[PDB]
């Protein structure tokens, strides 16, 4: 009849790894169009959605299970222990000041990796300090860099269909910012290290003068941008150059990057393969090397998923660490603003510039003061060696590719021998509940935000991929949301008891490499909940609970596709995750040059 | 303007622009057989949804939840900032035992007068027996708790107050009451009473766990699936003070009503007028106290279920701050509007029961971080005390929107009496977005209740509920997940409005209900009734304290034409129960309860 639960009294040796993959049809082209109309149809529409929910065990969890826990609507963290060997910085200091403290945590820059080098060395991306050193040594100017970037955008059509990196780009505004930045390097007063650095903002974050469409073709008609967002205003005050708005999966409803209105962004490592969603353009423009870093959102993996598939670094901050004022996902309970950079050094600098909780979340979440990891230290490995790396073996190997489970396993052995890390076995109970509780916790705010727009007639202007998801989200009742928040408390009490034994939780970022794009889906989208969910089977933990996580390249598989490793640490412990990730890049640096790559500084 | 989509703004509205939007609730009044078919239509597949969506479209709820962009981030649970410490109050630790707080609260009370219990002039007025009157008679050996228990049990059996059609209690065991009274009587003979509440009779609502009686919540099957095994937090504290748990009170089924109509156990009748309703959902708790059987009772208040019956029956009900009292061991735990509040015959009794049951849960202590409990110095501690230096907020349009000219003036008489006898300032205020508060409340209370019992109803137990509950559940299943998000966005708007009001005033005074005791239609006694118009009209003042968490209280302030009780509500700042209790104490001084109800039982003789 009904199933009974009790959270804080389960035996961890009793929890069995339940691996239920998602079951949904794979429709493209015309059959997708008719399927969307059947879902939006009156009577038959509700039957198809209730069938999909009961087939995937969601009705059994929300409606046929009594949960004794009280709802935890927003992530609630206890007072954490202070992390060891870190530099505390003020949370309300100017981003120009935090960039200087961060410059002290980085190892000393050596000029032998930019100007003069042996022409028989390996491949590496350009660090932010490589541009900063060249701007200050009068080797190049941000104006000449902007011209070379704009030259590539227009030569290859990366600002127009079918394969764009940016969906809102203005060359005249890029030159306007690079001129004022160049004249500050000539007068001898650069603002900070980020002065002259090109960054790309995702289309769901406000950034003047471009409007915020969120991947749609009509959001600027009902939601006009007034001022810069909290993260862009901080970046702009450091002298950064906003390149433009990035292509994304429509409204973040997808983990592939399919956009049937502007085009599907292609993976720089293989143009016939997806980039990963939803920050598709942000990840591709950084992997291609056009810009140094990019800002994106992550309410279900939209920062780490496209970072692992494209071979870059994506930082997912703690819930509330970065101010979300001025974006489409503000007010949610899983989303944050995270950077996507080519190397760890670049992502750390951007994190130092954009961090800072909002005035509201400061009084509700009570965050700890920000910390910068001392990435360089001649003393013994004080913190790196004394870390316990939690690992769920049955969850670690459940991947659709034997290459990514062993290439991550090689890094763990490399971490234990070259530093002394203890790999502790853990168990993550109720993994199917965390997926069901997450999908409703991400969709309900998104559907509510656009509900007055859809009922006014703008629902037909959405892609078939979004309308299919919104049809499922309308099935979630208010009682279903309450039960999901009660599940969020259970998953919280489990992970808190895990973080008392281990410091981080290492897992592969995705369960597969860069997937192939079916040629029929390029005409109007596709519904593939099986593959969309399969990409989130490792990142839903940090979103639903708010823990900070990161994605780092750890090598490549058989066909040369990037492999991503995830490191999720304690709340507010970005410095712990950043420092550990810095050692992972030291053991397995990015070496393969992607197919679509552009060298700027030359 | 309302053309395509509506657009809002919160912390930038002009309070001089806000105009009062009055009563709007429209719904059918169906009883008997027409009620049964209407329920079958609502539970019918296709036509059931169209009727609900019509009622949501007709009452303007769909335009609020679906056709209005709200520029606020959702506030799921009541968030309060740091409050200014209330003046002239006694601070007591939140960790002390309930017996220790009782001795501290006894110091705050004025000196007891034995000339009001044993020896008095036989030509005086009417007055309820206070808790200290029982404690005096027990300790002076004028009577024992065993003799008092035999007197109460004699009345319950003689008038069938534990049986249909008009019961006060739905779970009553006479053998258990004597068992608790025997142990209480010995402690007075041995000379070691536990506290002042030792020997006092209190009644627990049926949705609160209280051994050995099971918890049904007004239903007839909830004990089959939810069995109680230990006392609740509020009951275990009262039992540690020597209180006598009289039994589980009658209530509206699962708190889904504000009238007290229960077609499974009967409808409890108002002691002032048996042909009239008691007010819900704590119908039995308020009737057994107003009748003089027990000194106090425990009930819930998620939408006025403590204040509404207290005003209709002529007693005092204390709605504490959200999180102030532990709700562990009840059917409403984990909510966002409900609390456990006492219902007593006098302010002195409610203040003592509040001191014994208070105490935030270990989870709510960390998330809400409440200030330490404070007890008001009820005696004349200063002379021209802080009572006069209080600003009373009043919304004149909202104050007078009542379906009876008597309750609007009898409450206005108390305000003039407070200003002349103490010096209170009556500041005019405005409460913006009153219709949004009603919409955001009903979904915030209905969704967790429906989610609590969803596995039981889908297991076939949905047919065993009354038609009144199934009517509400048919509406509650219509609230989508996106509708709940927008409702919490409205909770933040009403919060920023009321917080800016508390920057100017200390409390907000309004009438408790917009009408006196309504008459029970003789057809509703068959299988309940659906009357959302009256069910909502009784909550038009008490929803602000539930959706936002502010403490409120309902105090009798006189009677109307036909001799029915009138209630006045005082809602204060968060965690400021002492401010609300102190001002309410002065109100009972200026207008005490003088009319004896029809059904009344003197216990001490
Ligand atoms: P990111 O953080 C991308 C994260 C993915 C969010 C979108 C997922 C929605 C899935 C679509 C439909 C629902 C899937 C399963 C529901 C249950 C049964 C239906 C098959 O973006 C910001
Ligand atoms: P208390 O704190 C009593 C509070 C009232 C709870 C039950 C009220 C439910 C109302 C019934 C139906 C819904 C009313 C309006 C919805 C909108 C349109 C429907 C016509 O109990 C603990």
- Resolution in Å, one decimal, please: 3.2
Tokens (6 digits) for B172: 């009553």
Which residue has its alpha carbon closest to ligand 2 atom 17?
B56
Mutate to test the interface with B, among A482, A487, A490 (most CBs of B within 10 A): A482
Chain A residue at shortest CA distance from B331: A68
Residue ranges per structural domain of chain A: 1-602
Q: Which pair of structure tokens corresponds to residue A569? A: 């640490």
The answer to whether the beta carbons of residues A312 and A94 sit under 8 Å apart is no
Q: How far is CA A489 from the centre of its chain?
A: 23
Interfacial B residues in 55-114 facing A (CB < 8 Å): 65-69, 72-74, 76-77, 79, 81
Token pair for A388: 């316990």
What ranges in A119-207 are assigned the alpha helix state H?
A: 128-136, 142-156, 171-187
> What are the DSSP calls for B347-382, one per residue?
HHHHHHHHHHHBB--HHHHHHT-PPPPEEE--S-SS
Q: What distance in Å separates the CA atoms of residue A195 and residue A190, rounded to the nearest whole number?
A: 6
HEC letters along B187-204: HHHHCCCCCCCCCCEEEE
Is A358 near chain B, with CB under 8 Å? no
CA–CA dist B316, B309 (Å, integer) = 9
Q: Are A360 and A230 in contact (CB under 8 A)?
A: no
Pull the structure tokens for residue A278: 């939803």
Q: Give the per-residue SS3 of A223-251.
A: CCCCCCCHHHHHHHHCCCEEEEEECCCHH
Cα A510 from Cα A307, distance rounded (Å): 10
Give the C-alpha separation, B418 to B509, whole Å: 12
Q: Is residue B101 a contact partner of residue B355, using CB atoms and an 8 Å limit? A: yes
Directed axis angle between helix B481-502 and helix A431-453, to 10°?
70
Strands B391-394 and B425-428: parallel
Active-site hit among A114, A260, A278, A475: A278
Residues recorded for chain B: 605
User: What residue has token string 């002290």?
Assistant: A104
**How far is A473 from A383, CA to CA, in rounded Å?**
44
CA–CA separation, B71 and A452 (whole Å):
12
> Which residues, numbered 169 to 228 in chain B, qualify as contacts with chain A under a Cβ-Cβ cut-off of 8 Å?
225
Rounded to whole angstroms, the Cα distance separating A318 from A337 reads 10
Return d(Cα B228, Cα A284) in angstroms, integer. 58
Q: How far is CA B528 from CA B36, B442, B450, B521, in A?
A: 10, 20, 20, 10
CB of residue B281 inside a 6 A radius of ligand 2: yes
Q: Is B209 in the pocket of ligand 2 (CB under 6 A)?
A: no
Residues across chain A: 602
Cα separation of B208 and B234, whole Å?
9
Contact B480 A474 (CB under 8 A): yes
In 3D space, the residue among B322, B317, B304, B319 whose CA is nearest the CA of residue B360 turns out to be B322
A288 in Cβ contact with A326 (< 8 Å): no
Collect all residues with Cβ–Cβ distance below 8 Å to A496 and sequence separation of at least 6: A78
Q: Is B96 exposed, middle or buried (0-12, 13-18, 19+ CB in 10 A)?
A: middle
In whole angstroms, how far apart are CA B42 and each of B46, B47, B50, B468, B474? 9, 7, 9, 12, 6
């Amino acid at each position: 009849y009904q199933v009974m639960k009790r959270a804080s009294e389960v035996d961890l040796s009793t929890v069995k790894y339940k691996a239920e993959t998602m079951k949904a049809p794979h429709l493209t082209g015309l059959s997708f169009k008719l399927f969307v109309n059947l879902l939006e149809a009156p009577l038959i529409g509700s039957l198809i959605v209730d069938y999909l929910k009961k087939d995937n065990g969601m009705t059994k969890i929300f409606r046929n299970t009594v949960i004794p826990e009280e709802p935890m609507f927003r992530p609630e963290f206890p007072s954490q222990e202070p992390e060891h060997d870190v530099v505390i910085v003020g949370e309300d200091e100017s981003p120009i000041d935090r960039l200087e403290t961060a410059l002290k945590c980085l190892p000393q820059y050596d000029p032998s990796r930019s100007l003069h080098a042996d022409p028989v060395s390996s491949f590496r991306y350009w660090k932010i300090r490589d541009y900063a050193y060249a701007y200050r040594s009068k080797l190049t100017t941000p104006l000449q860099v902007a011209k070379r970037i704009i030259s590539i955008i227009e030569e290859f059509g990366y600002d127009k269909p079918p394969t764009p990196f940016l969906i809102r780009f203005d060359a005249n505004e890029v030159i306007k910012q690079a001129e004022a930045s160049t004249r500050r390097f000539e007068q001898g007063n650069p603002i900070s290290v980020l002065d002259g650095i090109f960054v790309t903002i995702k289309d769901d974050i406000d950034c003047l003068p471009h409007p915020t469409n969120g991947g749609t073709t009509w959001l600027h008609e009902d939601r006009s941008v007034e001022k810069d967002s909290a993260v862009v205003s901080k970046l702009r005050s450091c002298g950064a150059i906003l390149l433009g708005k990035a292509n994304m999966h429509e409204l973040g409803m997808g983990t592939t990057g399919n956009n049937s209105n502007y085009g599907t962004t292609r993976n720089p490592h293989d143009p016939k393969r997806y980039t990963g969603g939803s920050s598709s353009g942000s990840a591709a423009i950084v992997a291609a090397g056009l810009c140094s870093a990019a800002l994106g959102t992550d309410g279900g993996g939209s920062v780490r998923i496209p970072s692992a598939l494209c071979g870059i670094t994506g930082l997912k901050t703690t819930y509330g660490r970065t101010d979300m004022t001025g974006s489409l996902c503000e007010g949610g309970t899983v989303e944050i603003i995270g950077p996507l950079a080519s190397s760890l050094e670049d992502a750390f600098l951007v994190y130092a510039a954009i961090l800072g909780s909002s005035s509201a979340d400061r009084y509700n979440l009570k965050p700890s003061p920000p910390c910068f990891p001392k990435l360089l230290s001649h003393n013994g490995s004080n913190a790196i060696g004394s870390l316990r790396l939690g690992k769920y073996t049955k969850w670690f190997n459940d991947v659709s590719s034997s290459d990514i489970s062993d290439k991550c396993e090689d890094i763990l052995k490399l971490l234990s021998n070259n530093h002394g890390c203890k790999v502790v076995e853990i168990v993550v109970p109720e993994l199917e509940e965390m997926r069901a509780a997450h999908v409703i916790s991400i969709g309900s705010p998104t559907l509510s935000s656009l509900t007055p727009y859809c009922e006014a007639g703008k629902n037909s202007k959405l892609s078939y991929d979004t309308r299919t998801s919104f049809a499922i989200f309308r099935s979630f009742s208010a009682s279903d949301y309450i039960a999901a928040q009660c599940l969020r408390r259970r998953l919280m009490e489990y992970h808190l008891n895990i973080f008392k034994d281990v410091d981080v939780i290492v897992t592969p970022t995705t369960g597969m490499t860069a997937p192939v794009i079916p040629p029929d889906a390029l005409k109007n989208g596709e519904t593939n909940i099986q593959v969309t969910t399969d990409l989130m089977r490792f990142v839903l933990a940090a979103n639903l609970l708010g823990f900070p996580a990161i994605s780092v390249p750890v090598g490549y598989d058989k066909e040369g596709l990037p492999i991503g490793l995830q490191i999720m640490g304690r709340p507010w412990a970005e410095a712990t995750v950043l420092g550990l990730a810095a050692a992972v890049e030291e053991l397995a640096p990015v070496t393969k040059k992607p197919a679509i790559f552009y060298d700027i500084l030359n």
